[PDB]
Design a binder for this molecule. Structure first.
Ligand code: GNP
Ligand code: 5UU
Ligand code: MG
Lengths: 166, 468, 167
């Protein structure tokens, strides 16, 4: 089985940990406990092939912003997460994109753009706006809810597919 | 490269050398080191190593006491700031604001990352290894005190968070998208617990309810029950209660299968019993319940059962194949089992026995320390090997089964007690004597026995049904 | 090819049983082990000038899985029955292990050796004469081994292979 190093990045509170824990444990975390750096493992069959996913769950709080290079070096693919009810988190996306490209010195890094908390009615970021950005990056856009599981497997396993064909 | 505090005022600034750290031959992997060096690398300024954090927190008690670990990471956290440089001095002497470039860099690239990583050790410790604090209230007070008195805005969000996490842990829901299949019934109807038995419950539902039970038992085992080989030692009931509950379930179910078989004296009925057990095995295989699979395989290979040639002869060929395929999982030191486990799509229920043997042998077969240049270094590669096994165990504990609990069937299997009040030797001797009775050794002739079951023996089969 | 012998190690848990096979299979001059690799329980040896392959099953750590004993034992042609010389209970357990092996193999004469293992420096409680008398009453060899110095380890395994060859 092939091992895949996935990294989940994005502004504080967008739901990076909730997405990851929903994927790993099928459980929604209601608490907001700011992450420093957590690691998870998941054996899963994707398109008929057994994969071992290593998922790095990173810090969104700005106070940790000087410590990103080290995990960007190791990651093979990145979930770039914002919350669809948080415009600033969407604006923070391009900063993650650029840093990842710089660190790995590549314009061809496997990535998926994720618009989380799609269970909430009070949207402030329109799907079209996020889709436009995704197309300019050449990557898919998937809306998710760590709460209901909507899109969660799709987001993570799409990222695996991109690494696989990289 | 940043200058460091003097090693005389801050021990973790000692240079790496072969006398305090040895690496294996994109971050380094540590073969051995002093506790100081292990903790330095556990909280390194250059990179995070979350898997090292898990490995260390799972295994450290073999070389460091919990109270000393806390003292050492608090020591690690308390990093002196450098004095102003010549350029800073000259600015200050002229009434100007110093640039403090070196100070700012050391704060940003050494102090804040190391302190954050110390707090991450604290966070993981509390969240995933809370038993140290359950077993030592004073250790918990020290942790609460340390976290509760960290000052400064850089660490504030995490300190306030960890304080809340600790308080939660002191006083202490699944989503699937798809719904679980409908519970299946055979001769015994819902609520009629008195009639529940091997042949009267639906074989599909027997396998499902045992899989839920065995998955819960599997998922309940903590690394604390495993490190230091404590399940094999005198205090095993104290230190490894969840593991032992799990194993005793497996043992009891195996004995129950054997008992159901040899206490069915009529050959035709006994064949029906064995066939039904093989159908249950088939559903275990479908559910990736490998513990369940081996429960059955162990029963069929047991002395009282294996020798039942007349029974085996009448087992349908398609079931002989199922059983043989299951048996081959265990052949050649579980070669096919290990490959299958690593290929399926979870949820599954691993067989725990292999993990136990590999943990025990890893601990027994490797030294606690490596001696180098007159110094004793902690052999960390040994601990990493143990943590790789506990890590694999934990990985299969995450995924829950999408199956509905049937409370009465669950209770029936929780309360199974095939040995009754008998001791093990007495009971297993009884099983073998029953075996000899129902199918005597050659050249004694095969007797006939009256039937014992008043209900139909025909199986409902193991393909699930689905009404609207 | 060459003859392969399926040897099975049995005995009480928690008293250093695993050291016997580890010391045999081990590097021999580097004290380390990874039981997760196949090199860890297969070993090519020369015994009385005849090369053979030893396959050793030691399920140390799985003792509580008591209903799996038959299944594990069934795989073997020769057995090392191991007790710790500082644990009288493990010694008293031997009789039932032997009885269980005879039952599983359906034979009164199964190749086996009795092994008294010194797993630490704690006081010996089973004297060698006791263990010799017991082995003699069964008609099998007795070997004492150290879990630390590798003393007696080759003797235990080679003696069992001779019991198989001369069965
Ligand atoms: N309604 C809803 N709430 C969500 C969703 N995902 C996360 N949340 C909530 O949002 C809060 C922040 O979640 P969290 O996973 O901690 O975010 P994070 O991105 O990991 N934060 P950090 O960067 O600091 O580690 C939590 O209260 C969580 O329950 C979602 O999909 N829907
Ligand atoms: F895990 C397994 C897989 C296959 C078997 N095969 C069996 C064999 C024999 N008798 C059996 C009797 C029963 Cl009731 C069941 C299986 C039997 C004697 C002939 C050789 C094999 C046993 C255990
Ligand atoms: Mg988080």
């Amino acid at each position: 089985m092939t091992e895949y190093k996935l990294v989940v990045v994005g502004a504080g509170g967008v739901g990076k940990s909730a997405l990851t824990i929903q994927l790993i444990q099928n459980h929604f975390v209601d608490e907001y406990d700011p992450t420093i750096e957590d690691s998870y493992r998941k054996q899963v069959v994707i398109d008929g092939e057994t994969c071992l996913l290593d998922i790095l769950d990173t810090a969104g709080q700005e106070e940790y912003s000087a410590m990103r290079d080290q995990y960007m070096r190791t990651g093979e693919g990145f979930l770039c997460v914002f919350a669809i009810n948080n415009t600033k988190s969407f604006e923070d996306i391009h900063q993650y994109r650029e840093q990842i490209k710089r660190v790995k010195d590549s314009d061809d890094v496997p990535m998926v753009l994720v618009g989380n908390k799609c269970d909430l009615a009070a949207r402030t970021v329109e799907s079209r706006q996020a889709q436009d950005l995704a197309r300019s990056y050449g990557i898919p856009y998937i809306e998710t809810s760590a709460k209901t599981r909507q899109g969660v497997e799709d987001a993570f396993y799409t990222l695996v597919r991109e690494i696989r064909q990289h | 490269q940043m200058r460091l505090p003097s090693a005389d005022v801050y021990r973790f600034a000692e240079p790496d050398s072969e006398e305090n750290i040895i690496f294996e031959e994109g971050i380094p992997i540590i073969k051995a080191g002093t506790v100081i060096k292990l903790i330095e690398r556990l909280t390194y300024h250059m990179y995070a190593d979350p898997n090292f954090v898990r490995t260390f927190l799972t295994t450290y008690r073999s070389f460091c006491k919990p109270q000393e670990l806390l003292s050492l990471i608090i020591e690690r956290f308390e990093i002196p700031e450098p004095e102003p440089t010549e350029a800073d001095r000259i600015a200050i002497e002229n009434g100007d604001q110093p640039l403090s470039a070196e100070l700012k860099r050391f704060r940003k690239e050494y102090i804040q990352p190391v302190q954050l990583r110390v707090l991450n050790v604290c966070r993981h410790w509390v969240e995933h290894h809370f038993y140290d604090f359950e077993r030592d209230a004073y250790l918990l007070q020290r942790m609460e005190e340390f976290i509760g008195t960290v000052r400064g805005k850089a660490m504030k969000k995490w300190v306030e968070s960890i304080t809340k996490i600790i308080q939660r842990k002191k006083i202490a829901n699944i989503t699937f998208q798809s719904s679980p299949p409908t519970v299946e019934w055979h001769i015994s109807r819902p609520g009629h617990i008195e009639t529940f038995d091997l042949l009267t419950l639906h074989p599909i539902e027997i396998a499902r309810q045992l899989t839920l039970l065995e998955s819960d038992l599997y998922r309940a085992v903590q690394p604390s029950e495993l490190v230091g080989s404590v399940w094999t030692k005198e205090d095993k009931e104290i230190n490894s209660p969840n593991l032992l509950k799990m194993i005793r379930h497996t043992t009891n179910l195996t004995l129950w299968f054997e008992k159901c078989i040899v206490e069915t004296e009529n050959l035709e009925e006994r064949v029906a019993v064995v066939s039904r057990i093989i159908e249950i095995l088939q559903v275990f295989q479908e559910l990736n319940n490998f513990n369940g699979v081996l429960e059955v395989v162990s029963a069929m290979n047991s002395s009282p059962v294996y020798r039942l040639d007349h029974t085996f002869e009448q087992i349908p060929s398609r079931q002989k194949k199922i059983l043989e395929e299951a048996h081959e999982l265990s052949e050649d030191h579980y070669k096919k089992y290990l490959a299958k486990l690593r290929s399926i799509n979870p949820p599954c229920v691993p067989f725990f026995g292999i993990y136990l043997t590999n943990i025990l042998k890893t601990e027994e077969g490797n030294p606690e320390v490596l001696k180098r240049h007159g110094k004793e270094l902690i052999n960390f590669s040994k601990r990493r090997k143990v943590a790789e096994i506990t890590g694999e165990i934990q990985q299969y504990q995450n995924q829950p089964y999408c199956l509905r609990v049937e409370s009465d069937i669950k209770r029936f299997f929780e309360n199974l007690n095939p040995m009754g009040n008998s001791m093990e030797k007495e009971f297993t001797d009884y099983l073998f004597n029953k075996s000899l009775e129902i199918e005597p050794r050659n050249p004694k002739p095969l007797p006939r026995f009256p039937k014992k079951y008043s209900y139909p023996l025909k199986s409902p089969g193991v393909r699930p049904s689905n009404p609207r």
